[PDB]
Nucleic acid binder design. Structure first.
Lengths: 732, 692, 247
RNA sequence: AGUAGAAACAAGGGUG
RNA sequence: CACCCUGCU
């Protein structure tokens, strides 16, 4: 009786058993080396998708340009890049007609937050590409380096302390001709002219997608320069402001909101009286989305959205797509040859890849190289149309929801009226009609006006089905939503933060899955026990009665040998776990306080221990767990001696950039001293214009004189402090 | 004069006044009469701040010094010229101290005479118009505003104060001097775009316009005048979304590839392992591992000098002989150390690959080499289907004669909901305990923890590790199981996906000739013999590898047990919600409910609930055991067709767009893994057995 | 006041002089987090790799004079290895466990007041109410609901100014209190937080958590009492209800 | 050899 | 060569 688990679906619906189709208890694939072939593949794909566009140039730079503007319209089912100007204009003029005041409300609100915002906020965010060091640097580092290299040469506005003037200065940057750059060779100096400067500031680098499941081949992801994240933040606030308040949008969105939103969008149409009109839903995914959207379209869209505002705002916002149109993408890393079957191995220059034939490397990659040749100008390719994944997230959804909106009974001028939801990667298109030909015609007009705007349904993935059971964004709906405890198995486990910062996240995740996604109580007990065991193994904290041998055996043996009631002993000190569902919402120390020994508490809770490290308040009882992109998770647990911080990577040392580490030591020492004066600098980035020691010496004089008026201190300290102030001032 | 401020006044005055000044559109010369007034305000304030100092005896005495020599303090508390946040720092420090109210607009001074606070102001406005405008500014509080004026005017709270006059005389002299000696010059956000970047913007226009200004002027006057109607009238009729149907008959199969067969890729054996048993009260993590291996190996009679039975087509197979030949040697070494390295015998060197790495020589010096070419960059060779997997599944589902998963209890329960859930999990764990998939996950976690630990500790030492597992029995006593041995290799692992190369030796009783295809890499090396009947006992020996990610995921494998229960108890939820009673007992015990869980020549054969539970364990186990980048592609492209078939099966009128393309996608994932190939065969057979 | 002498010590050097003399207050923000390292974009992997090494965690310097370099058995408890990018010290987990039997003792009975929000929960749960279990379909509606068991209902910034006034009193600027209720609260709070050795940001954070109101889009069935929204685990589930009311 | 796959693991820079 | 800095730079 050879078994087959797929025979299960002859009794249980394929949407009440979907959970048993995810191979998500395994490991995801990764990328074993360079990703430059992907880069030229995608670049060639764009330049061929927009072929009968126009070939053009630049007078300032030289990187070849290509216009995918309307030109010849399509002629068969083939992804193309000839969206229409008049289409994108009317498509949102109509949207405005649908709900008045959206665009002007957005203009007002974003105007306000734009004049209010500051440069320091940039400090948070993902990694970035530094144009002075030619490399992927974290956020604050690139920030500091660009400000510094700005001050080095002749600029005078950045000292404003704001943000908008920082962006202005970025703007002014592109008018000089002789920019000076500092290098960290173990600190030489180099000079870059106007051309190679403009070239240098527009380069977003490429990398290989990693650890993402649901696909066979790998992908490529691009990261943009910190020169332009500023303009990005303005256009992002604008678009998000437009789309926070659209029933058919899901970009400024949350979680269960999505489910309730589509639930009420199903109700009406599902409610459509069963009188004379049948209806289907099409589950549709858009293929090659960001390879047909363009900069000119976004720019004309902006020229329409912010009509009738101050010119300050309109210019500021329209600079982003212009800078976005003339962009260049780095080729990549190179290729690690064998060069023979004997012991030879090397690495070639990603530049000589443009200087070598590469006939040695497979003739398919030879085709890649030959086609990509005319697009390289300096270590980078000219990607005039298209855009690489991960740069915008909003405006595309606004176009999608607009062409959705085109389909009401108001302007289609016939019986067919289509609508639905659009969520960045999916469209659920519910069509309503009395006639089968009605549904045919509706789908045709939809796909037609879509190809008019450069969003092309994927016929290979999209399917029609009577309403009642459909799925989108891996949410599966069968006359209502159901639960799949499969996409949340990755998060189940020792989060990898600390000890106490994890004994809480585990139970917190079990909490959320027991409240929202249908994880019954038996399974709650189950995952609780599994988490306990995995924790105890990864942290070597087994029970006190256990004679399992580890590096932390004898100490914990001590701790156990002298305690009147060990039920007070913490989990990661050798204590019995007493969590349940009743106890599942209270961190552990708060739960077992009543049962501790006093001296224990004094040794475990005392703030005189050196293994606690508190940073800025933006990071306290928080953690960024691994998931979509990474979101910030919060937890709660009594701060104790277990909240350590594991080490860092000692790898800059055997390199030519170790001096950055010493610069960091010096900065940090300069900063801790300041912190010694105003503890309030944990709840406020203090604003001021000084030399950062004026604050110190000033408050020094003040506080001394104060304490001496009431408190008990002798005056020799008064005099000595005053002459040490004379000291600190006698030099410069 | 334009620079009359840097001309005659004091530099300190100039800087401390300008710093507070340059804060808005005001430039260094704007309406050049006012700066003089601002700086003169600062001068008179500062000069008032001189010539007064406190004695420890708290008097008020004029001190000619104008600078205290020592052991003193000045009678003022300057707040002008300071910093914004420091200003409030100071004033609030003054507040919470002995005596000070909360002032609401920027004051100037303070005095510890009787705990009071002064404000000052001098401009052209003569006496009370200024005095009364100041009142309007600050009246809501009681404060000691001692104002001065040009000629002689000064007033105090009820004209009640205590201070000397020679200072105010000095103030008179100051205002005397600063009549500019009759004033001999008689008196009294935009963000444009530059050139280069505006050019760059121009180059970004649709192909008829030539200036961004005209583009603004054109988008300004827009109103729908017929775009979609007319264009969709002019757009040729081939571009369309035709609708295609999906009828009763479930379509043609997904054609599997063709080639030579498929072999076992598991990093360890599955249904060809033995178990040497020792009675020992050792717990799960107890005992010296090497020592238990000793006590295990000792109780077997029939070892003989090994001879190669099944060569390894590509390799110097004699080495493997010597490899095993070394092991017993070292075993007699420890009659114990908790860890044992292994000498660098060359039989252990080739079989683990030292110096098999082309030296990263510089490229520019080696461009003359004849074979200078990039490597691989091609596709995996194809394969076929072989019929062992189904036997492996069938054996995996079976119930053993041994428990294998002892669980760490939790806190007691009082709530009845907790009692119910506990009584459910009792039965679940009773059924899901005795299963060969539990043996799998136990062995897997133990082997991969030992591997990552020892590979992190020693980074040039050929460690070896035995594989012992722990499992109790129905009788009550607990046994100890030995399965074989593992030998590790050098472990400089920088990237997340670097490889460690390790040799594995496993016991077995399966004569390999009966199925040589699945042993293309193993090397059966007959070691000893058993007695019952006499059956030869073999040792499958091989060289494989692992990475950091695979090791990590192998660390957490009991998570598969979470994908099982959640699907079994959701079968009890939807069915306990109806009968209005505690249903789960009648669903696990005396259960009649069945479920189609397979296919046989007699037809589809059903199973009780525990059959479903173990069957569900098995797939979760194999998704990790044989994890592969083809399995995910297959599952993700086949869930579509599975849902479409389901939607058809219950009258939802399903219609498609392109089935041939979806079939091409489902087929492009099937290359060589026994796993994805078995799953493709499964889905095809199910589509055949589920027409509608 | 040793602090100003330390300031001079840091000032005499050329590098720190040039830095401090040319670091405006605003730049301080930047300088707080200039770093050549990034974030661990696989938190569990690296953690498994760290727990097998010998010196994985990091501590301050007061260790040596507070915790012995040797052990009672001989296991190293800290090392001379200075850390990268910092001036801290590498330490093995073993130190922590010792500190838990041979460690400095202090007074933490004024401890539970800092963490009022938490202990409130357990003193509640102790006095719960028992009730039967019922199985039936359960109507669910996803709506917005609050989860804090009582608070001041004051704004985020409205409590931010409150906290800045109470905990760092010398540094609250020209802002003043307006309401009498909040005045009385700040009064009793300035009273309570006296004579308690405890982390500054930690206590201020506990109060910030106990003041501001917070709401979430949650699938509720029935009442929306915050004391109820605490116990959604055992109150109601997928297909059952359990009878219990918060203390 | 082995891992694996559209590229790379099978330790790399540093001093005599 | 003989030695030792690295294990996400």
């Amino acid at each position: 009786m050879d078994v087959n688990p797929t025979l299960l679906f002859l009794k249980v619906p394929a949407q009440n058993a979907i959970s048993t189709t995810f191979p998500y208890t395994g490991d995801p694939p990764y990328s074993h080396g360079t990703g430059t072939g992907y880069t030229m593949d995608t670049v060639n794909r764009t330049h061929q998708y927009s072929e009968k566009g126009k070939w053009t140039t630049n007078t300032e730079t030289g990187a070849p340009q290509l216009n995918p503007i309307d030109g010849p319209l399509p002629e068969d089912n083939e992804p193309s890049g000839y969206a229409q100007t008049d289409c994108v204009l009317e498509a949102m003029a109509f949207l405005e007609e649908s709900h008045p005041g959206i665009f002007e409300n957005s203009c007002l609100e974003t105007m306000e937050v734009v004049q209010q915002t500051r440069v320091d906020r940039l400090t948070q965010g993902r990694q970035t590409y530094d144009w002075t060091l030619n490399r992927n640097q974290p956020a604050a580092t690139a920030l500091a380096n660009t400000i510094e290299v700005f001050r080095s040469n002749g600029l005078t506005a950045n000292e404003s302390g704001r943000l908008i003037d920082f962006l202005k200065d970025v703007i002014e940057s592109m008018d000089k001709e002789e920019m000076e750059i500092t290098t960290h060779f173990q600190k030489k100096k180099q000079r870059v002219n106007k051309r190679s400067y403009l070239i240098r500031a527009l380069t977003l680098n490429t990398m290989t997608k990693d650890a993402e499941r649901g696909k066979l081949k790998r992908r490529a992801i691009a990261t943009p320069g910190m020169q332009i994240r500023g303009f990005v933040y303005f256009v992002e606030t604008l678009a998000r402001s437009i789309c926070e308040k659209l029933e058919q949008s899901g970009l400024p969105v949350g979680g269960n909101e999505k489910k309730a939103k589509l639930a009420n969008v199903v109700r009406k149409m599902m409610t459509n009286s069963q009188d004379t009109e049948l209806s289907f839903t099409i589950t549709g995914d858009n293929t090659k989305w960001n390879e047909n959207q363009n900069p000119r379209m976004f720019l004309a869209m902006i020229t329409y959205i912010t009509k009738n505002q101050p010119e300050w705002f309109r210019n500021i916002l329209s600079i982003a797509p212009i800078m976005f149109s003339n962009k260049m993408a780095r080729l990549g890393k190179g290729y690690m040859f064998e060069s023979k079957r004997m012991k030879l191995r090397t690495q070639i220059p990603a530049e000589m890849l443009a200087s070598i034939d590469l006939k040695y490397f497979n003739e398919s990659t030879r085709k890649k190289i030959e086609k990509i040749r005319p697009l390289l100008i300096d270590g980078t390719a000219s990607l005039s149309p298209g855009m690489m994944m991960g740069m915008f997230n909003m405006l595309s959804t606004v176009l999608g929801v607009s062409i959705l909106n085109l389909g009401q009974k108001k302007y289609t001028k016939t019986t067919y009226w289509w609508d639905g939801l659009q969520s960045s990667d999916d469209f659920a298109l519910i069509v309503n009609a009395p006639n089968h030909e009605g549904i045919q015609a509706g789908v045709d007009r939809f796909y037609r006006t879509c190809k008019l705007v450069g969003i092309n349904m994927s016929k290979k993935k999209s399917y029609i089905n009577r309403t009642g059971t459909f799925e989108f964004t891996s949410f599966f709906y069968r006359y209502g939503f159901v639960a799949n405890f499969s996409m949340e198995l990755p998060s189940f486990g020792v989060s990898g933060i600390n000890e106490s910062a994890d004994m809480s996240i585990g139970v917190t995740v079990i909490k959320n899955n027991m409240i929202n996604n249908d994880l019954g109580p038996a399974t709650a007990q189950m995952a609780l026990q599994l988490f306990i065991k995995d924790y105890r193994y990864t942290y070597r904290c087994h029970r006190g009665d256990t004679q399992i041998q580890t590096r932390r055996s004898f100490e914990l043996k001590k701790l156990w040998e002298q305690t009147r009631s060990k039920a007070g002993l913490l989990v990661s000190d050798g204590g019995p776990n007493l969590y349940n569902i009743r106890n599942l919402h209270i961190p552990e120390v708060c739960l077992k306080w009543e049962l501790m020994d006093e001296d224990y508490q004094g040794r475990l809770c005392n703030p005189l221990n050196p293994f606690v490290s508190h940073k800025e308040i933006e990071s306290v009882n928080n953690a960024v767990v691994m998931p979509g992109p990474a979101k910030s998770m919060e937890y709660d647990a009594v701060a104790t001696t277990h909240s350590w911080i594991p080490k860092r990577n000692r790898s800059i040392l055997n390199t030519s950039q170790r001096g950055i580490l010493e610069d960091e030591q010096m900065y940090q020492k300069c900063c801790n001293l300041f912190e010694k004066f105003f503890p309030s600098s944990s709840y406020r980035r203090p604003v001021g214009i000084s030399s950062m020691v004026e604050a110190m010496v000033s408050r020094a004089r003040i506080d001394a004189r104060i304490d001496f008026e009431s408190g008990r201190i002798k005056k020799e300290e008064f005099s000595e402090i005053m002459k040490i102030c004379s000291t600190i001032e006698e030099l410069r | 004069m334009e620079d009359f401020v840097r001309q005659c006044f004091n530099p300190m005055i100039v800087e401390l006044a300008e710093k507070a000044m340059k804060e808005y559109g005001e430039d260094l010369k704007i309406e050049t009469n006012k700066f003089a007034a601002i700086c003169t305000h600062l001068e008179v304030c500062f000069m008032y701040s001189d010539f007064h100092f406190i004695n420890e005896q708290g008097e008020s005495i004029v001190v000619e010094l104008d600078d205290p020599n020592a052991l003193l303090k000045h009678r003022f508390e300057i707040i002008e010229g300071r910093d914004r946040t420091m200003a409030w720092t100071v004033v609030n420090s003054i507040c919470n101290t002995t005596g000070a109210e909360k002032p609401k607009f920027l004051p100037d001074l303070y005095d510890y005479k009787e705990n009071r606070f002064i404000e000052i102001g001098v401009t052209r406005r003569e006496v009370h118009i200024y005095y009364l405008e100041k009142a309007n500014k600050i009246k809501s509080e009681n404060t000691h505003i001692h104002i001065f004026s040009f000629t002689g005017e000064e007033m105090a709270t009820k004209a009640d104060y205590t201070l000397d006059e020679e200072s105010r005389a000095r103030i008179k002299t100051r205002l005397f001097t600063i009549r500019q000696e009759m004033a001999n010059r008689g008196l009294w956000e935009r963000f444009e775009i530059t050139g280069t970047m505006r050019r760059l913007a121009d180059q970004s226009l649709p192909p008829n316009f030539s200036c961004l200004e005209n583009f603004r002027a054109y988008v300004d006057g827009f109103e729908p005048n017929g775009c979609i109607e007319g264009k969709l009238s002019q757009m040729s009729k081939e571009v369309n979304a035709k609708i295609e149907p999906f009828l009763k008959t479930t379509p043609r199969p997904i054609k599997l590839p063709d080639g030579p067969p498929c072999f076992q890729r598991s990093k360890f054996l599955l249904m060809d392992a033995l178990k040497l048993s020792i009675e020992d009260p050792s717990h799960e993590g107890e005992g010296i591992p090497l020592y238990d291996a000793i006590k295990c190996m000792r109780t077997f009679f029939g070892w003989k000098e090994p001879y190669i039975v099944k060569p390894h087509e590509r390799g110097i197979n004699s080495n493997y002989l010597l490899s095993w030949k070394q092991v017993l040697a070292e075993l007699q070494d420890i009659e114990i150390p908790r860890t044992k390295n292994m000498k660098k015998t060359s039989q252990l060197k080739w079989a683990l690959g030292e110096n098999m790495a082309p030296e990263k020589v510089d490229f520019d010096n080696c461009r003359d080499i004849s074979d200078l070419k990039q490597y691989d960059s091609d596709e995996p060779e194809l394969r076929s289907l072989s019929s062992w997997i189904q036997n492996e599944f069938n054996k995996a589902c079976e119930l053993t004669d041994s428990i294998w998963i002892e669980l760490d209890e939790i806190g007691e329960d009082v709530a009845p909901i907790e009692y119910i859930a506990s009584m459910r999990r009792n039965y679940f764990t009773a059924e899901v305990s005795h299963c060969r998939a539990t043996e799998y996950i136990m062995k897997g976690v133990y082997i991969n923890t030992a591997l990552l630990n020892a590979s992190c500790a020693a980074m040039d030492d050929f460690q070896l590790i035995p594989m012992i597992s722990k499992c109790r029995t129905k009788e009550g006593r607990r046994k100890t199981n030995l399965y074989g041995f593992i030998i590790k290799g050098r472990s400089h692992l920088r990237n997340d996906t670097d490889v460690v190369n390790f040799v594995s030796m496993e016991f077995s009783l399966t004569d390999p000739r009966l199925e040589p295809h699945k042993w293309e890499k193993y090397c059966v090396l007959e070691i000893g013999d058993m007695l019952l009947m006499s059956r030869p006992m073999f040792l499958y020996v091989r060289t494989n590898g692992t990475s950091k990610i695979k090791m990590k995921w192998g660390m957490e494998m009991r998570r598969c047990l979470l994908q099982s229960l959640q699907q079994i108890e959701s079968m009890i939820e939807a069915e306990s919600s109806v009968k209005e009673k505690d249903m789960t007992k009648e669903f696990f015990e005396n259960k009649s409910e069945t479920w189609p869980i397979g296919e046989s020549p007699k037809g589809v054969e059903e199973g009780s609930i525990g059959k479903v539970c173990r069957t569900l364990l098995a797939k979760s186990v194999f998704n990790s055991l044989y994890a592969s980048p083809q399995l995910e592609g297959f599952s993700a492209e086949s869930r579509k067709l599975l849902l479409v078939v389901q939607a058809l099966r219950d009258n939802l009128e399903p219609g498609t767009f392109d089935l041939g393309g979806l079939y091409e996608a489902i087929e492009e994932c099937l290359i060589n893994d026994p796993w994805v190939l078995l799953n493709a065969s499964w889905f095809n057979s199910f589509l055949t057995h589920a027409l509608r | 006041m040793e602090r100003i002498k330390e300031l001079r010590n840091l000032m005499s050097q050329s590098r720190t002089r040039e830095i401090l003399t040319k670091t405006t207050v605003d730049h301080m923000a930047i300088i707080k987090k200039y770093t050549s390292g990034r974030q661990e974009k696989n938190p569990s992997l690296r953690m498994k790799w760290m727990m097998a090494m010998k010196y994985p965690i990091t501590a301050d310097k007061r260790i040596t004079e507070m915790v012995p370099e040797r052990n009672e058995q001989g296991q190293t408890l800290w090392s001379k290895m200075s850390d990268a990018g910092s001036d801290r010290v590498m330490v093995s987990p073993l130190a922590v466990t010792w500190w838990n039997r041979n460690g400095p003792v202090t007074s933490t009975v004024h401890y539970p007041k800092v963490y009022k929000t938490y202990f409130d929960k357990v003193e509640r749960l102790k006095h719960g109410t028992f009730g039967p279990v019922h199985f039936r379909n359960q109507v669910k509606i996803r709506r917005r609901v609050d989860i804090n068991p009582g608070h001041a209902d004051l704004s985020a910034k409205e409590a931010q100014d409150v906290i800045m006034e109470v905990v760092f009193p010398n540094e609250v600027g020209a802002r003043i209190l307006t309401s009498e209720s909040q005045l009385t609260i700040t009064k009793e709070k300035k009273e309570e937080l006296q004579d308690c050795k405890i982390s500054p940001l930690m206590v201020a954070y506990m109060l910030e958590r106990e003041l501001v109101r917070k709401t979430r889009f949650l699938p509720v069935a029935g009442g929306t009492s915050s004391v109820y929204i605490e116990v959604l685990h055992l109150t109601q589930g997928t297909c059952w209800e359990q009878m219990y009311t918060p203390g």
